[PDB]
Ligand SMILES: *[C@@H]1O[C@H](CO)[C@@H](O[C@@H]2O[C@H](CO)[C@@H](O[C@@H]3O[C@H](CO[C@H]4O[C@H](CO)[C@@H](O)[C@H](O)[C@@H]4O)[C@@H](O)[C@H](O[C@H]4O[C@H](CO)[C@@H](O)[C@H](O)[C@@H]4O)[C@@H]3O)[C@H](O)[C@H]2NC(C)=O)[C@H](O)[C@H]1NC(C)=O
Ligand SMILES: *[C@@H]1O[C@H](CO[C@@H]2O[C@@H](C)[C@@H](O)[C@@H](O)[C@@H]2O)[C@@H](O[C@@H]2O[C@H](CO)[C@@H](O)[C@H](O)[C@H]2NC(C)=O)[C@H](O)[C@H]1NC(C)=O
Ligand SMILES: *[C@@H]1O[C@H](CO[C@@H]2O[C@@H](C)[C@@H](O)[C@@H](O)[C@@H]2O)[C@@H](O[C@@H]2O[C@H](CO)[C@@H](O)[C@H](O)[C@H]2NC(C)=O)[C@H](O)[C@H]1NC(C)=O
Ligand SMILES: *[C@@H]1O[C@H](CO)[C@@H](O[C@@H]2O[C@H](CO)[C@@H](O)[C@H](O)[C@H]2NC(C)=O)[C@H](O)[C@H]1NC(C)=O
Ligand SMILES: C[N+](C)(C)CCOP(=O)(O)O
Ligand SMILES: [Zn+2]
């Protein structure tokens with residue numbers, strides 16, 4: 001007779017879950033035709049290799065492929081309280097074949113697709129470098145694209161997020177279904193090498209100042225933060241000594257993340273179209289923060305490349321009310337199989353804790369895994385290299401130089417530690 005909240009039965013609180021999808025790269029031109037140089041504009045005159053209804057390795061995504069990915073999510077039976085979506089919706093075609101209006105039209109199509117299929121799901125998007133015309137030229141002041149995506153994403157974001165999105169293409173947002181969790185969606189395309197608009201700027205769009213203030217507020221308000229962005233921090237795992245964003249920005253952003261590692265419970269990136277891990281550590285090798293690079297839905301590659309990825313989407317599990325990451329489930333589409341029979345079978349690729357026999361996704365757990373990778377002929381690393389391409393090629397091999405680059409980039413996000421790793425292991 002005193003209106004006290006009803007106590008839940010002391011069962012185990014189910015884990016929380018969220019989806020991460022990235023790099024959809026819709027090619028609206030995709031159509032099967034006898035002249036394989038006309039299957040898709042994204043192959044740029046090359047012959048599609050073996051095209052089917054769900055795509056080709058030399059093409060960006062048919063609409064049917066993207067629809068199959070989101071249909072899989074919708075029908076998966078997995079509960080999820082939100083989704084993160086880290087950008088890159090238009091296809092890889094020459095600048096004159098696009099325009100601002102065409103870019104906005106593709107992002108609108110992808111946004112409405114998600115909203116139609118998932119009417120009750122809060123989605124946290126970030127912009128990719130292709131989400132602007134010309135590609136990679138994302139500005140440091142408001143623009144038509146920023147204003148358009150701010151309008152498109154209003155169903156998911158509050159007024160303050162909309163206002164920063166419109167001005168600079170970034171925002172933070174409290175997660176409605178998850179009190180105490182805030183998403184910080186950065187515009188790391190401001191730091192991407194090809195961006196002429198940010199050359200020699202110390203703090204383009206004031207994003208560093210805003211990020212520091214946001215994290216400081218989260219720290220004092222006892223929030224936890226998930227960082228999402230398109231281009232990741234750290235070093236390319238397939239090239240030597242090449243930061244993914246300009247070195248000046250990589251060093252500055254990493255220093256902010258080290259300072260606020262106690263608040264940041266996850267970092268989630270796209271852009272590479274590969275499945276990669278990184279572990280941010282301090283200068284002495286003590287692990288601080290776990291980083292998860294998710295592979296793309298598009299399978300596209302250039303003619304020059306030997307390997308590509310199968311389409312992928314992924315699910316994270318986390319501790320409710322606490323937001324510590326517990327697991328990651330990677331799903332994929334075997335594109336060759338799907339095209340041969342004409343029917344998609346999105347399926348489990350792996351569960352991280354089971355694949356690698358780790359307890360959870362905390363920095364110390366993953367740091368110990370990466371130390372295993374470093375051992376000669378590590379079977380853990382062989383598995384990881386297979387998953388890097390989302391199981392595209394079980395016979396792909398990683399020679400000594402290849403592996404040094406991979407492991408050094410997983411373990412060492414800043415220039416000093418990365419170069420020291422090269423010194424010791426080249
Ligand atoms: C996604 O789905 C695709 C399609 O089903 C799978 O790809 C097929 O995988 C099978 C088995 O792994 C392949 O069949 C095997 O091919 C081997 C030779 O492979 C090389 O040469 C072929 C030549 O056509 C290339 O296509 C290929 O890329 C390789 O470079 C053979 O050695 C195998 O023969 C053995 O099989 C049995 C017993 O093992 C016996 O009958 C044989 O005598 C011999 O012992 C076998 O034929 C098949 O070629 C692949 N198809 C395609 C189109 O690539 C992927 O595995 C799947 N992905 C995942 C992650 O599961
Ligand atoms: C794109 O492919 C066409 C077709 O190539 C043929 O078809 C494939 C299935 C494979 O069997 C190839 O070895 C074949 O040659 C290419 O056009 C052909 O190229 C040569 C040189 O001109 C000639 O023998 C054919 O007559 C050409 N045309 C046709 C209709 O066969 C074309 O060169 C390829 N384009 C690119 C950019 O690679
Ligand atoms: C980081 O934040 C602290 C705390 O600021 C407060 O945080 C919230 C309660 C919010 O209500 C803000 O308005 C508050 O100001 C900053 O330290 C405070 O501000 C100055 C620091 O020189 C000092 O006079 C206050 O006493 C500090 N308050 C407390 C509780 O310690 C700190 O400076 C911020 N850092 C940056 C870089 O912004
Ligand atoms: C997103 O774009 C796709 C096509 O790129 C749309 O799907 C097609 O829509 C037109 C009809 O208007 C036709 O080509 C087909 O009927 C549809 N399917 C395919 C595979 O092309 C889709 O409707 C768009 N969605 C939104 C929300 O704009
Ligand atoms: C640049 N890349 C080809 C290595 C990765 C893909 O990047 P993006 O062109 O989709 O932005
Ligand atoms: Zn991309």
Ligand SMILES: [Zn+2]
Pocket residue numbers: 088128129130230271272
């Ligand atoms: Zn990109």
